[PDB]
Symmetry: D2
Subunit: 318 residues, 4 copies
Amino acid sequence: SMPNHQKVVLVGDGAVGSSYAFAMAQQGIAEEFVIVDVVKDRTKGDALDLEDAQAFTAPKKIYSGEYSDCKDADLVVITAGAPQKPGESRLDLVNKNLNILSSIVKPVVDSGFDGIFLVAANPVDILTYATWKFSGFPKERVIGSGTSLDSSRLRVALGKQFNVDPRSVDAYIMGEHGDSEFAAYSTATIGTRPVRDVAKEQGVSDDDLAKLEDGVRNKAYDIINLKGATFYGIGTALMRISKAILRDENAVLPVGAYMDGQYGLNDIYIGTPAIIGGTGLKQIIESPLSADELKKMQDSAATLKKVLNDGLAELENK
Amino acid sequence: SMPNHQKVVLVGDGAVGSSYAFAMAQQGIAEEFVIVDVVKDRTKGDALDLEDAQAFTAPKKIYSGEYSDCKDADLVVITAGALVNKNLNILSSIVKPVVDSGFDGIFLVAANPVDILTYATWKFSGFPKERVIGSGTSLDSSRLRVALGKQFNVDPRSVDAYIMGEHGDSEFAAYSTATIGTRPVRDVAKEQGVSDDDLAKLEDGVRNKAYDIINLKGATFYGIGTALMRISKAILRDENAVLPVGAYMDGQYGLNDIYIGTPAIIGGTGLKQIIESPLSADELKKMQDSAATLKKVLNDGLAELEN
Amino acid sequence: SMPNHQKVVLVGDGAVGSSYAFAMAQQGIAEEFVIVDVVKDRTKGDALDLEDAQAFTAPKKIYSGEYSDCKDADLVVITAGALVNKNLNILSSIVKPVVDSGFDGIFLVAANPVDILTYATWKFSGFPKERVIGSGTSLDSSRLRVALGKQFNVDPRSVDAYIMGEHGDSEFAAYSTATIGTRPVRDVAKEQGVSDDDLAKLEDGVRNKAYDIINLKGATFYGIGTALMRISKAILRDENAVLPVGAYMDGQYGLNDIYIGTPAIIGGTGLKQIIESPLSADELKKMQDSAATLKKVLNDGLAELEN
Amino acid sequence: SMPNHQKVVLVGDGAVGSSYAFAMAQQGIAEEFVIVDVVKDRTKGDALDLEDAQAFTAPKKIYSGEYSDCKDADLVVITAGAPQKPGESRLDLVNKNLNILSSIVKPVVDSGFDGIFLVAANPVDILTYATWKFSGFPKERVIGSGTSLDSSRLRVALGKQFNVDPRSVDAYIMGEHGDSEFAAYSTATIGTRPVRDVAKEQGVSDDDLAKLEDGVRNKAYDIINLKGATFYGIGTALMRISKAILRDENAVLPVGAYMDGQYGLNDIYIGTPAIIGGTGLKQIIESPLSADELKKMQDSAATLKKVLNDGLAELENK
Ligand SMILES: NC(=O)c1ccc[n+]([C@@H]2O[C@H](COP(=O)([O-])OP(=O)(O)OC[C@H]3O[C@@H](n4cnc5c(N)ncnc54)[C@H](O)[C@@H]3O)[C@@H](O)[C@H]2O)c1
Ligand SMILES: NC(=O)c1ccc[n+]([C@@H]2O[C@H](COP(=O)([O-])OP(=O)(O)OC[C@H]3O[C@@H](n4cnc5c(N)ncnc54)[C@H](O)[C@@H]3O)[C@@H](O)[C@H]2O)c1
Ligand SMILES: NC(=O)c1ccc[n+]([C@@H]2O[C@H](COP(=O)([O-])OP(=O)(O)OC[C@H]3O[C@@H](n4cnc5c(N)ncnc54)[C@H](O)[C@@H]3O)[C@@H](O)[C@H]2O)c1
Ligand SMILES: NC(=O)c1ccc[n+]([C@@H]2O[C@H](COP(=O)([O-])OP(=O)(O)OC[C@H]3O[C@@H](n4cnc5c(N)ncnc54)[C@H](O)[C@@H]3O)[C@@H](O)[C@H]2O)c1
């Protein structure tokens, strides 16, 4: 933006977007943080509340804005989206969120913005592909949160089972982010040893690992049943991806990336290990999944593909 | 708690307590964080949500508990409550089982009205004054720092300024003891065309900020979640850091036998010592007037409590 | 330099420059760090040693380079040297190729004597005053903070105190503008049985600390490696933080056309503004006397190399 | 030590011990740091220099002490040693350092100290075993730096080769810490993909990987040739292990641990993945080495054990 001064624009100030902003304030990442949402007064109240964290953390210019403020932004994070109502279908979550997204991306690009998009709005793989499509940006400049949140929940759960720090569990959730997703246990390790071997060694059966994987898959549902909403894990994950970009780290993170052959997939965004740096996605790393895990991945992707395309077809049914 | 392992118990899992817990997770302060509230499902759900921050911050054992879990805690932070009477009532239901668990660390009190409830936590717990610390004017001092920082294009952390008085409407900016780069804020203000009226409006903004945030988005919690993390850090990393907290007056400012906001040095054993800001005669009058209603309300609530 | 990628060039890889680089690696500040010095085999070896810190701190591209690597650097830190005439000579060999590389970021000057070499870096580079910052009295102000902190059982970061004057023997503790928790250090001292004589001895300790560390272990570098990392942080994270630095006097303290230590606001464009500490009449006399000598030696050295 | 106040005693204030203390000061780990060395005025001058870092980092009580200051310490870090001279034999390096060590450990234990030992003095696996033996402490309360420095140099090297952050390279140097040591490539990964596959994929041959491993093995030697001494990497590694202990992390780190069957080894300390926490070593994790790599490891260990017992035998020859 101006010398030694990085600028992030948040589009979508709900609990996700807001706990992301607070995590970015606790971490001292970026020097200017713009909050954009249709509920303008909300964004003015949250900027005032957030900016009070500065006396004890690090200075940051936080304020309520508009899409034109994206002009010289380095990163635009899209968390804006509607929740799935009771009785509502999955394709209708897609439908309304594609609509909301198409209202966001065009003015963001028309502001002159040419930094990176980070997309976290659900369903995230569909909406990341659609952000790429609507913006016309290079694939590497559009990154989705993919399976970063669920991979963290798998790390927390394996960490808890095996009395290890979650950051020392090298494990990924693969597939499209919900119910068809699975723990990629075949490529998962703790201290370079396979999680299944650590498991067997310690009396943890493959059934126990299956229940653990189920816990991870149901965790969003359980947190929403207990307290109404879930946002701390993805606010943190979005801060970690923003950090890899803004501190040019070339760090390996679970993100959503454009498939160009990897895993036998094409023209979809889906969750992968990938190297993230200051220009965006540097490269995709294909986790060497077992034959069973790769079938799961391709199945999950096949149906994601179908829903991505119905959604987009309906968006052009004018 | 167990070797090289610090334990914090949060009593009160509303938006203040919860954003405090999140700030503690982003900062890697303490190794075990227990969430206690009456509404158990909420705390169970928040521990699960909070613990997912660990894969990208630092490991922490976060879970939903009960008052008995305070037994070997180092710090109990009370953010619970809904007014003086209903909050004294809620507080008396919290402190007695926390002390009966065998807890003997430090209380950090942030439930409103904070000065009254901090003194009542001291009175109900029977702890030493230095082991009961209130948030006092830490939040509004931060808001003053942010506002002066914005006015003068300075980092809020370089604004040495305090809000004094009892935490609401009778409170004031102690401008006579406030500085930026050791220069008095009123002189910086003059030098830059900012009048004493402008400083009075700025002080008004600070005093009204909670009200304005609640009008715009319904609730205000990020500033005090952060302030509570900063005081917790000074305690758990034994820093002897100078912070705005609520402390027991023993003669300072001409006050006795109330908790109120002061500069104080905070460390591993709790409050190390109070530092009396050398207020102008006008500012000291405001402080003593503000303090004078406090003593009446506090004592009305404590006597009410026992009938 | 390239997207979301800051670049620092260190000129001078002795113990100061090297411990600065290590502090920048522990802190994760800047993404690329180039080490430039006359002895290339030392800079090569230090880049290899330093880069091993990355597996457990944060990634950084550290390598040995030349002045041409300053082309697109954001910050050039000059710690190189060997008195006034030999260091002015070494400096003039550094600045001209650094500027000819096309560099137009900020200079941070720590080479001794620092106030004289900071002014000469401004003069030889032709840069704006705000883009040439010296370390001024930042190290000795830190030593005063550590000593008052130790005397009064306070965290050094909560001691608001500056060493003023030209950085050695004529320098003094600006006690009249120094505070802990907004209370004057002399009042805290008097309240605690610390006499003005005791404060004078404390100030002597700070003034002699470099000499004493060199007598005990041969060299002193950790304090200035840290202070240089803090000023670099305020620049690269655009903080507008108030720090002790060396800045161009333009009337402040009754001084003109010398660089000397002041409180100042530091941000992403360099020095944002000088803050004149409101010194007592005695302290201002000391400052002006000290400055008067600096100013002679400066213009003598500069006239000598113009021959 | 006293409430919410951790205490570390450093024995050995040369360049390693001193850059460790500086790294601990920049990181705000521990509240009290005692510097002990036979050269007392050096520990006094370094405490003064070090404590000046506090105004801009975090408060720490740093001072020069004696072995009796270990009484209530949580951690004692032994970096004290004499360097190998030209013409001197490997067993004579072991010999003088065993002598120095026996002069350190007994007064440290007699002070009443019962925290954890972290041993970094060279040769580190031999001296870590001897610290265990001389102190009489549980194996889990005596931790050596093992291959942590060289594993970091391998991570930095693979990171540089593959344009990845070193912290995202899951790779270990195994064997006894010098010349017989090797890159455990078979259990090494980047984004869960095997380093050899990433290598093959990107045109980096097994020969190239062998040269890379040679660079790592020779890096200490090269740094000493260029600038006279090498200390920043092990000062940081020692701070990272101290952090895992003092912040009870159960983090997986390269350390030196007592072999009780692992890798087919017994009654030696050697480099392993292990989980480190507030009570010391929580558990050893056996990297599933290829048969070739395990042969290398066992040969390296066989010869370390030989030198170990030669040195301890000469220390008993009175
Ligand atoms: N990617 C992941 O893994 C992950 C996980 C959980 C949640 N999230 C997602 O983040 C998104 C937001 O969640 P939240 O907690 O912030 O929800 P929320 O319902 O509390 O807030 C959503 C925000 O979207 C805004 N919005 C809706 N329509 C708008 C429009 N047309 N233009 C601009 N803004 C508009 C609302 O005004 C609101 O502030 C969801 O789609 C959610 O499922 C991501
Ligand atoms: N000190 C300050 O400067 C500052 C500033 C703003 C808010 N806060 C205060 O902190 C407190 C909480 O604020 P909030 O916005 O999170 O409100 P809140 O009412 O949503 O949350 C507090 C929680 O305490 C719980 N609680 C009530 N009785 C309890 C009991 N007996 N035991 C355990 N838990 C119980 C409730 O279930 C409630 O949700 C309030 O009193 C508020 O005014 C402090
Ligand atoms: N400003 C302060 O408050 C402060 C305090 C202490 C030390 N320092 C100063 O920083 C400087 C370095 O101190 P040190 O302890 O590292 O001592 P040192 O003598 O080892 O370092 C000076 C460095 O400058 C190098 N050098 C000389 N000519 C050079 C050239 N033309 N190009 C590049 N490099 C060149 C030397 O080789 C050496 O590495 C000194 O002048 C010292 O007094 C600053
Ligand atoms: N573990 C690793 O991977 C690794 C890597 C590099 C260096 N190091 C090691 O750290 C140690 C020190 O390295 P350095 O560069 O700091 O060395 P140095 O030679 O600069 O200093 C060694 C210190 O040991 C002290 N010492 C010697 N005899 C003593 C005694 N009897 N009691 C107490 N102290 C005494 C000396 O006085 C000296 O200050 C060495 O053994 C070195 O091999 C470890």
